[PDB]
Amino acid sequence: HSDGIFTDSYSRYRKQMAVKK
């Protein structure tokens, strides 16, 4: 099961968060 925050993209988008700071 997955849904954005729970999948791959988020895993790669999550970190991107801090990075974009």
Tab-separated table of N, CA and C in Angstrom:
chain	number	residue	atom	x	y	z
A	1	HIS	N	0.861	-1.218	0.000
A	1	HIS	CA	0.000	0.000	0.000
A	1	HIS	C	0.883	1.249	0.000
A	2	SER	N	0.423	2.314	-0.597
A	2	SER	CA	1.238	3.560	-0.628
A	2	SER	C	0.359	4.738	-1.055
A	3	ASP	N	0.814	5.944	-0.840
A	3	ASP	CA	-0.006	7.126	-1.235
A	3	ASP	C	0.839	8.405	-1.145
A	4	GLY	N	1.789	8.591	-2.026
A	4	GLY	CA	2.626	9.826	-1.952
A	4	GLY	C	3.567	9.709	-0.756
A	5	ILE	N	3.351	10.501	0.264
A	5	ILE	CA	4.231	10.430	1.469
A	5	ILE	C	4.570	8.968	1.775
A	6	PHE	N	3.708	8.058	1.417
A	6	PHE	CA	3.996	6.624	1.679
A	6	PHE	C	4.324	5.921	0.359
A	7	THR	N	5.508	6.114	-0.158
A	7	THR	CA	5.875	5.453	-1.439
A	7	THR	C	7.325	5.790	-1.783
A	8	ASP	N	7.631	5.959	-3.039
A	8	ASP	CA	9.031	6.285	-3.414
A	8	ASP	C	9.178	7.795	-3.595
A	9	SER	N	8.414	8.379	-4.484
A	9	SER	CA	8.514	9.854	-4.706
A	9	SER	C	8.757	10.565	-3.369
A	10	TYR	N	7.833	10.460	-2.451
A	10	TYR	CA	8.016	11.126	-1.135
A	10	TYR	C	9.413	10.819	-0.600
A	11	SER	N	9.789	9.580	-0.572
A	11	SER	CA	11.137	9.243	-0.060
A	11	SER	C	12.165	10.155	-0.735
A	12	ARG	N	12.004	10.402	-2.007
A	12	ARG	CA	12.963	11.291	-2.730
A	12	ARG	C	12.544	12.757	-2.566
A	13	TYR	N	11.278	13.004	-2.369
A	13	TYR	CA	10.800	14.406	-2.204
A	13	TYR	C	11.007	14.819	-0.742
A	14	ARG	N	10.822	13.906	0.166
A	14	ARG	CA	11.024	14.226	1.609
A	14	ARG	C	12.378	14.917	1.777
A	15	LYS	N	13.450	14.198	1.575
A	15	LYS	CA	14.802	14.814	1.717
A	15	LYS	C	14.838	16.146	0.965
A	16	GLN	N	14.419	16.150	-0.276
A	16	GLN	CA	14.432	17.415	-1.072
A	16	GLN	C	13.987	18.578	-0.187
A	17	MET	N	13.065	18.334	0.703
A	17	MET	CA	12.593	19.427	1.599
A	17	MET	C	13.801	20.136	2.212
A	18	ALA	N	14.413	19.541	3.198
A	18	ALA	CA	15.598	20.183	3.834
A	18	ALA	C	16.510	20.751	2.749
A	19	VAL	N	16.951	19.918	1.845
A	19	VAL	CA	17.846	20.396	0.744
A	19	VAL	C	17.391	21.790	0.283
A	20	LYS	N	16.138	21.944	-0.054
A	20	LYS	CA	15.644	23.275	-0.508
A	20	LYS	C	15.555	24.228	0.690
A	21	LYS	N	16.627	24.396	1.421
A	21	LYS	CA	16.588	25.313	2.595
A	21	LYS	C	17.966	25.948	2.792
